[PDB]
Paper text:
The resolutions of the cryo‐EM maps were determined to be 2.5 Å for the two fully assembled complexes, 2.8 Å for the hexameric ring without the shaft, 2.5 Å for the tetramer with the shaft, and 2.7 Å for the tetramer without the shaft, using the “gold standard” method. The rotational angle difference of the γ subunit between the binding dwell and catalytic dwell in F1 anc_core was approximately 34°, smaller than that of TF1 (Sobti et al., 2021) (~44°). Thus, it was confirmed that F1 anc_core has two distinct states pausing at binding dwell angles or catalytic dwell angles as expected from Cryo‐EM analysis, while the motor pauses predominantly at binding dwell angles waiting for a long reaction step to occur under ATP conditions. Thus, F1 anc_core essentially follows a reaction scheme similar to that of TF1, featuring two stable conformational states (binding dwell and catalytic dwell), even though the binding dwell of F1 anc_core is significantly longer than its catalytic dwell. A candidate reaction responsible for the long‐lived dwell is the ADP release step that was suggested at or near the binding dwell angles (Adachi et al., 2007; Noji & Ueno, 2022).
The minimal subunit composition of F1, acting as the ATP‐driven motor, is α3β3γ1, with the γ subunit embedded inside a hetero‐hexameric stator ring consisting of alternating α and β subunits. Here, we used ancestral sequence reconstruction to infer the catalytic β and non‐catalytic α subunits of a putative ancestral F1‐[name]. To reinforce the structural integrity, TF1 was used as scaffold to accommodate the functionally crucial core domains of α anc and β anc ; nucleotide‐binding domain (NDB) and C‐terminal domain (CTD) of α anc and β anc were genetically fused with the N‐terminal domain (NTD) of TF1 that forms the stable hexameric scaffold (residues α1‐94 and β1‐78 in TF1).
Author numbering:
A (entry chain A): 26 to 499
B (entry chain G): 232 to 287
C (entry chain D): 2 to 470
D (entry chain C), F (entry chain B): 248 to 374
E (entry chain E): 2 to 468, 471
G (entry chain F): 231 to 469
The structure:
């Protein structure tokens, strides 16, 4: 029969008699209305994981099969909404009428269904788009200590996607409802909610919903990829997602492994992150890029979960607690951060100046330590030091203020050719704001040429137009 | 005296460079022993949880 | 309906219900038995339901001692969780985990009783109007401002000053903010509950405060549910009276250790370093209910014991996630005579942004952390080489860092009896003005001794003269 | 008995570590489920139900007193162990003894920069 | 014959048999079910028998996802282990763990299938004629020779050039040796497998190669059995065709980790650092079949991921018990601009003894390791003090070392899309003659820059005249 | 057989470290509770029951002999590990070989600072 | 063996010596048995009854008003870890404890007894002479000061240590090897005759080194000599 009865209830885990025809991974409904996953099928009982408040469930309660594998609603109707891990609305803006539902468990694209990534994903951050390029089907990790800017980089990226045809999905796993509310309001203030979907499983939600959240957010991201469009998925913290799975596994009495996590942890994150990819032209050419985030205790990158995800992903963005408290934003460690899949997808115009930036910062980052004193080093090293300091000022950028690629090219071109070598370090920020407004207000020809050609042909106009700004208004 | 100051500052610099290098190899070797002692102890505690739970 | 005791093993008791229906999870049960003959003992016990087992049977955690229990004793279902008195009648009273009064003053006679297990506020009911709660304490108000509706954590070892700093904060809110406060003594030492009760009964602060204690000698089930009792009493003032209230929790480390002991008693597999597998879920059930809503706000000050100086232990580590601000107290400052002993270089808050606090506040607090760090980078050279080798700029930077380091010190009212110093409250405008005047180098020809234990900067300037200099 | 009659008493427990081991033995042989360092979850309640009985009574109760001096032994200096951290959190102060100071000729061998008492000042005389 | 699913727990599935007899251990089972109503899902699955339980019941490990399975579903016993096609019709083809073709080229239509679990060769069938396999790669062929029928370990971080070197070896065997290669991928990024497939498809190597994949996203049952599929396909070329063939394994560390996950799921008690208790047995079942016999030979190159950058870990320690040689790709060499990145001082092999290789080969390899160590022991004086302060003997040793360090470099054929260089092949006699000629002081006039990326020694002499 | 008949014999065990791993596998599959480094409690009796059968018999028994040369493998030179120190506690002497000295051109690479024999001096000829 | 030694104390009133080469084996035999009996394991897999079983053996080995039992016992330390339940449980029962160090054995100093971890109940000013107490105090202190300096001597050159620390190193070097002695039962291993030293010559010997009378004597002369007069002729045998 379709119905069974509860025989035992613990912390969010239950066992039931009956349910003869239920299938592995099926959604099951409780008489109260709460829902659960049928995980284990035994000779005489079914092990159910509860997807809501378990305190209303008792021994002897009726439980019924839904006749469906665990699925989440998908479609265009979800854009501009806040939902829970089961797709249910949590914004109060009424019901959602999605007509399509896809499982949260799908096999990733095969070896021949894919192609290498050739088109970029613009983040709007001058340190990332120039030194750590990102493709439209890449998996990049954001990693660092708590309270260092990890979500701010992800929100700045989503706000930069206003002009591009990218649908952004943000998944909150174990986050405080207050911070979630602050994120939803920041996205509405900047208009990002016209092309964004927010999925939430907050710190008070059961560990089962915090486990399902990234898979549901990935299933919403796949619908756009299956129709040939581009999608971006953000996972606010994989560190809390691992803790949530550790809880369910220990409560199912599974033996632990390294650092008390189960052996199955690596498969939990490889199965998730391998689904983000750029499809081949025969499959439709669609794409899905992922930006997972991880927290390290005291800067320890060697821990189990951090190294486990470093082995799955295509590159990392390293954030420092010391730089964040030293007045620097976004506080990215450019001497350690790198992308493997990037560079091939980057535009020609950024490549013509990024090479100079990387060589100059390498020289500065090495000698900066030895040249800590004011002027003991020779002119041959002093020139490197001042250039490094000035380029470091050009790398600084305020919160929720993405800079477009054409403007990034002209400011980075200004620093890497030595036109800022006589400007005092304290005036570089004022020079950047003034120079970009000067070029946009009366020289839009330079910006429109970069936007359509994606390469620098003739730079001669920019050299002459820039000298005119320097002589008239410092 | 000028040559003595140059040789003193160079001697203190080269000696403290070797001392700093010695301190770092000692810190590296000690850290590997600290990591091995701590890592060896953690896998035993995990083994006691397995044996203890299987004993009920 | 009525059930019967089936097993007894330390703080754990199993009960069978048979006919009618079984109680819900977290539901409270009562045992009231009178000795039938001289070989028995009278018993008055409360139990909390933890899990269903089958055979019409339930496992429970005892709220008091299980000594004298007998198999077959009758048990009664109250139909709800532990319920505690709420309202203005709860002000100036001491309470047990079950909400019964400890003090001999009589019955509380309140009009309503609220359950200890209720759902937190929804994402819709969340408010985002961030602002600053003035404490009058010169180190917190500058380096780690407290957000209204936010959580502040005090981290440190034994004897650093956590409970005295909590007692001074309770006083200051009752002095100028005129608000209602709740103190939850989670696993409190009975020697300290006596000192908190006496300071508040003589200073008059008790009439505006609620005290919830239980005892460190009670079973783990009581040490675990007590922080929720203080919180359920603080919720009524926000939700039904629309006020802004401050909740003080002394040592959530005891709360974490008590959930571990309950999980081990129930038979759950140990997690990292032997803690319960549910640690992050249990911490959050308490931290989430503390938030600013459209009705009012609950802000919270919490003390955390750092075992063996290790901040990576699961208890401190799970707590950091729910903290808007952080204070680390250093034993090296406490023994050097600097109180409250907060480390200027490890204390931080989320609200330390120009969009939430003044440009002058942000700029001064930045210049303070910078000059202190610069002085820390030079104390090796000042000890091995003569101070006569330091440059003119570094020499002045050292002297200013030296004045600023002690200017962070402040005499507390609750601590006047120990040293005999009257006690001071400093407003935000004078904290910012004070550090700005030292940083700007206006006040240089004043001796370092004048900045130790003084309140405002005018008091330091007159003190220089009082010391004939 | 002495405290209840208005007199003063002092109680020394030569080693609480062997007392915890004795309880571990009985609890494991009775099949109660183990926890941290193989001990029963009940072990904090064991020492806290004991050490909280040491107190100074009010004048209405007679003004009597009972002070306690429990002792604990650490394996190779591990103060972070289960029973040591458990009893360190219950007491009003701790005296730390170092094997290093003892062989170096500092004979009572007390770590004065680590040892602490909360009652310090209030316990001492004005001189 | 006809079982029925009795339990389901992730990859683990329990089946009860009746009216006949039970299947053997390692045996494959098949579930083929069509949705009876709109509430059910179609399922196509394969299971492998792990152990007998009593009460006519058997425990099995699923090869694919178990979602949608129902207690009471019919199960078909295939009567034998996982069987995969064998023959020359497997070359230039991509396969799954069950031997089904991945590529859309059609059915393989091979004449025979071969069981994947088969006994290794006995002591009476072995071959003690240790000889060498010319790779044409100048660092491998001198400092760490590869024996026919042996096991070689490849070490290096993500991005140091492992995929580049693997393809260079597969290509080189297909170029002059005209032999067959097999590549197996376990716990690997599906992205990397695609980058290797296109790079092979353009270099023409695919027609002489077999590809088998078990991805990083596949369930533990598939990641555990995939290396055996490549090996069962390589054995037919040895046994029924008498050839010498090369087996590549993407990461035997994911082979080791996949066995650890299957063990944890089966509920066996773990050993030191949480690896499976059977790690040594499981490593042997794969490693002993990889041997040379009186019919023909199989050799294998295996890449190892060193967890936490520490070799004391059990998987590396249990792998080294089976290995004959080690090749280390170094990050410090990679940043220096050296593309093959093989460390001359950390690479070694069992074959590198005077009683296996010729006296002249041992003498040159000894003189090379010694001059490179001597040069590494002197770069501090040369970097901290002026180069004019070194003595005549150390100066001439440095000049020879400066030429030799870059004369070890070789441009790869698979690197034309990166750097455009034609690619070079160096034979054993010119490697020995080249290093001997520099060591004996006969060729010291030629400039240093001429020895970087040139192939044989004569090519450096013409490059010095042609660069101007 | 040779010793029981008055003849002399010698036996080599190529690696006792692998013999121990095989017994750990059989014992864990029989579900016996593990101890140090997951090896069974019975692991000392395993090697001591084998190595004490090597002896020189008395003249009344025939004067025969059986010498033994077991071999063990150390991870990273950790001579202090469980199975290595366990067999060292049963044998009449140890010959320790250094992986560090071996790459410095030294053979047999025996570390004389750690290597020693309990039967030594007495078995050696007078010269 | 203990039941046979008890008869001579209880029924015959005699003074006896009881030697036990290994009490650790007695503990492991109880551990091997415990799992099969059906007991729950404790720390490092040991039996829950470990301290009770060691006390059943050790409380019987005592001197009474009838006679006396003196005992020498050897305790094996697995994997060189003294924190192991078996060695740890045993320390509570002993009146004197001698710990042997591999670092001393690997350096050729025998019997290899660790001077900083070895102790006895009898080492009190009320039970031994003022001269004995003062010499033992000065020996333990100089060796601890030398142990606290091997890091500083590794990071900085020995020419950077003060004159006092320089002398303390030379005296600690002479003392650690003057503690070495050739045994009669070890003539096969040591290649030397074997020596017996009376307490008077031990105290006189260490006092003479501590007081600096022998600063102009090589460290190598103090190795493998029974008494101080021998060290001085061993210096003469080398120009
Ligand atoms: N402001 C202060 N001024 C002087 N002494 C103080 C002050 N604050 C703390 N102390 C001293 O240190 C002790 C702090 O104890 P407590 O509040 O229990 O510290 P903690 O909980 O951090 O361990 C006090 O009992 C008192 O002796
Ligand atoms: Mg405290």
């Amino acid at each position: 029969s379709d119905v069974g009865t509860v025989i035992q209830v613990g912390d969010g885990i239950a066992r039931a008699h009956g349910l003869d025809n239920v299938m592995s991974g099926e959604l099951v409904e409780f008489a109260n209305g709460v829902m659960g996953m049928a995980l284990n099928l035994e000779e005489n009982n079914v092990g159910i994981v509860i997807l809501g408040p378990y305190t209303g469930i008792k021994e002897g309660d009726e439980v019924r099969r839904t006749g469906r594998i665990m699925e989440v609603p998908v479609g265009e109707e979800l854009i501009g909404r806040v939902v829970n891990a089961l797709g249910q609305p949590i914004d109060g803006k009424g019901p959602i009428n999605a007509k399509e539902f896809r499982p949260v468990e799908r096999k990733a694209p095969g070896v021949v269904d894919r192609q290498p990534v050739k088109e970029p994903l613009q983040t709007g951050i001058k340190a990332i788009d120039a030194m750590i390029p990102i493709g439209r089907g890449q998996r990049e990790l954001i990693i660092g200590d708590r309270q260092t800017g990890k979500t701010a980089i992800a929100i700045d990226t989503i706000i930069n996607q206003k002009g591009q045809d990218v649908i952004c999905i943000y998944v909150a796993i174990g986050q405080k409802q207050s911070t979630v509310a602050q994120v939803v309001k920041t996205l509405e203030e900047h208009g990002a909610m016209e092309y964004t979907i927010v999925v939430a499983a907050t710190a008070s939600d059961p560990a089962a919903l915090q486990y399902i959240a990234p898979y549901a957010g990935c299933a919403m991201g796949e619908y756009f990829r299956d129709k040939g469009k581009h999608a971006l998925v953000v996972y606010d913290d994989l560190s809390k997602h691992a803790v949530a799975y550790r809880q369910i596994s220990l409560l199912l009495r599974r033996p632990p492994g390294r650092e008390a996590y189960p052996g199955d942890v690596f498969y939990l994150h490889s199965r998730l992150l391998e689904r983000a990819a750029k499809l081949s032209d025969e499959k439709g050419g669609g794409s899905l890029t992922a930006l997972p985030i991880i927290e390290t205790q005291a800067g320890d990158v060697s821990a189990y979960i951090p190294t486990n995800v470093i082995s799955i992903t295509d590159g990392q963005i390293y954030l420092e607690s010391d730089l964040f408290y030293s007045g620097i934003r976004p506080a990215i460690n450019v001497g350690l951060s790198v992308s493997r899949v990037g560079g091939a997808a980057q535009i020609k115009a950024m490549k013509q100046v990024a090479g100079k930036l990387r060589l100059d910062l390498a020289q500065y980052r090495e000698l900066q330590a030895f040249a800590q004193f004011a002027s003991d080093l020779d002119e041959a090293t002093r020139a490197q030091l001042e250039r490094g300091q000035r380029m470091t000022e050009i790398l600084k950028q305020p919160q929720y203020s993405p800079m477009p690629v054409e403007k990034q090219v002209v400011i980075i071109y200004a620093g890497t050719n030595g036109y800022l070598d006589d400007i005092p370090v304290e005036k570089v920020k004022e020079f950047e704001d003034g120079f970009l407004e000067y070029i946009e207000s009366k020289h839009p020809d330079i910006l429109e040429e970069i936007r359509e050609k994606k390469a620098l042909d003739d730079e001669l106009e920019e050299k002459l137009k820039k000298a005119i700004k320097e002589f008239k208004a410092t | 005296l000028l040559d003595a100051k140059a040789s003193e500052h160079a001697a203190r610099m080269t000696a403290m460079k070797n001392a700093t290098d010695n301190a770092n190899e000692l810190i590296r070797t000690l850290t590997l022993s600290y990591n091995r002692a701590r890592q060896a102890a953690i896998t035993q505690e995990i083994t006691e949880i397995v044996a203890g739970a299987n004993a009920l | 309906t009525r059930g019967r005791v089936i097993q007894v093993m330390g703080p754990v008791v199993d009960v069978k219900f048979e006919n009618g229906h079984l109680p819900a999870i977290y539901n409270a049960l009562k045992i009231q038995h009178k000795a039938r003959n001289e070989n028995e003992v009278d018993i008055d016990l409360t139990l909390e339901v933890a899990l269903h087992l089958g055979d019409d049977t339930v496992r429970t955690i005892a709220m008091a001692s299980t000594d004298g229990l007998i198999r077959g004793m009758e048990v009664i279902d109250t139909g709800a969780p532990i319920s505690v008195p709420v309202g203005p009648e709860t002000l100036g009273r001491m309470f047990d985990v079950l909400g019964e009064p400890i003090d001999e003053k009589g019955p509380v006679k309140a009009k309503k009783r609220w359950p200890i297990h209720r759902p937190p506020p929804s994402l819709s009911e969340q408010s985002t109007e961030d602002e600053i709660l003035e404490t009058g304490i010169k180190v917190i108000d500058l380096l780690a401002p407290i957000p209204k509706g936010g959580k502040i954590g005090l981290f440190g070892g034994a004897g650093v000053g956590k409970t005295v700093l909590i007692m001074e904060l309770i006083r200051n809110i009752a002095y100028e903010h005129k608000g209602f406060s709740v103190f939850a003594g989670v696993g409190e030492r009975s020697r300290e509950g006596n000192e908190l009760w006496l300071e508040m009964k003589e200073s008059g602060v008790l009439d505006n405060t609620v005290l919830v204690f239980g005892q460190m000698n009670e079973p783990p089930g009581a040490r675990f549910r007590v922080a929720l009792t203080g919180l359920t009493m603080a919720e009524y003032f926000r939700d039904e009276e629309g006020k802004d209230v401050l909740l003080f929790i002394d040592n959530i480390f005891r709360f974490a250790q008590a959930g571990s002991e309950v999980s081990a008693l129930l038979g759950r597999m140990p997690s990292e370093v032997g803690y319960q597998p549910t640690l992050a879920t249990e911490m959050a059930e308490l931290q989430e209910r503390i938030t600013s809503t459209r009705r009012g706000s609950i802000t919270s000050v919490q003390a955390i014991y750092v075992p063996a100086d290790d901040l990576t232990d699961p208890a401190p580590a799970t707590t950091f996630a729910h903290l808007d601000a952080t204070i680390v107290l250093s034993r090296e400052l406490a023994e050097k005579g600097i109180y409250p002993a907060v480390d200027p270089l490890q204390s931080t808050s989320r609200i330390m942004d120009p969009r939430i606090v003044s440009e002058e506040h942000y700029e001064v607090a930045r210049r303070v952390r910078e000059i202190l760090q610069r002085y820390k980078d030079l104390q090796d050279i000042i000890a091995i080489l003569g101070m006569e080798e330091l440059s003119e700029e570094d020499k002045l930077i050292v002297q200013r860092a030296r004045k600023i380091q002690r200017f962070l010190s402040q005499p507390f009212h609750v601590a006047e009896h120990f040293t005999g110093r009257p006690g001071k409250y400093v407003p935000i405008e004078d904290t910012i003005r004070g550090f700005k005047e030292i940083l700007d180098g206006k006040l240089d020809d004043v001796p370092e001794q004048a900045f130790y234990m003084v309140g405002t900067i005018e008091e330091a300037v007159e003190k220089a003269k009082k010391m004939k200099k």
